Amino acid sequence: IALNKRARHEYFIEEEFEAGLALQGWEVKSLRAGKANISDSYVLLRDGEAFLFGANITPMAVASTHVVCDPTR
RNA sequence: GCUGGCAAGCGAAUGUAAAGACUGACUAAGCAUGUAGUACCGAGGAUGUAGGAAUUUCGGACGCGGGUUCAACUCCCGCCAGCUCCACCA
């Protein structure tokens, strides 16, 4: 369910909705399986309607053995 | 506007205020063509056919690139990231 145990133990969630996000082929096809690292995503104000911040990309072996796919994307 | 013919005082009754045509040097004050102005807008008028607001969506991304069914998000190919099989003795 990806409950975000940090945000569960601290400052219980109050409001949420449902929406997707935009990403490239590198950082995709693993979220379909479920692996990810979304613990305490630091989403801050962005001019483009608060672009997703904080959470990185899953460390699954989809790497081109240079980087995972994108250290910062 | 000073004057202009005089009644009215020099501080009195108290003023009509049009301003266009016509000659020409025209390239306004050498020098191209003139008798009303083609300029300049900015709150004076209009475009609203198309680009800006909503509104149907085209655009995108499942690795990329493109010649492919467009319904592509693997319908045809070259690579690269792993598995396997061997070729591979100057």
Token pair belonging to A7: 């945000």
Interatomic CA–C1' length for residue A43 and nucleotide B74, angstroms: 35
Cα A56 to Cα A60: distance, rounded to the nearest angstrom: 12
Cα A27 to Cα A17: distance, rounded to the nearest angstrom: 23
Give the 3-state secondary structure of residue A67.
coil
Residues with CB under 7 A from strand B: A 20-26, 28-29, 32, 63-65
Resolution in A: 3.2
Using C1' positions and the CA of A22, the closest nucleotide is B61
CB burial of A3-33 (b: ≥16 within 10 Å; e: otherwise) equals eeeeeeeeeeeeeeeeeeeeeeebbeebeee
Q: In whole angstroms, how far apart are CA A48 and each of A3, A18, A40, A62, A69? A: 26, 18, 21, 29, 23
Method: cryo-EM
Interatomic CA–C1' length for residue A47 and nucleotide B54, angstroms: 21
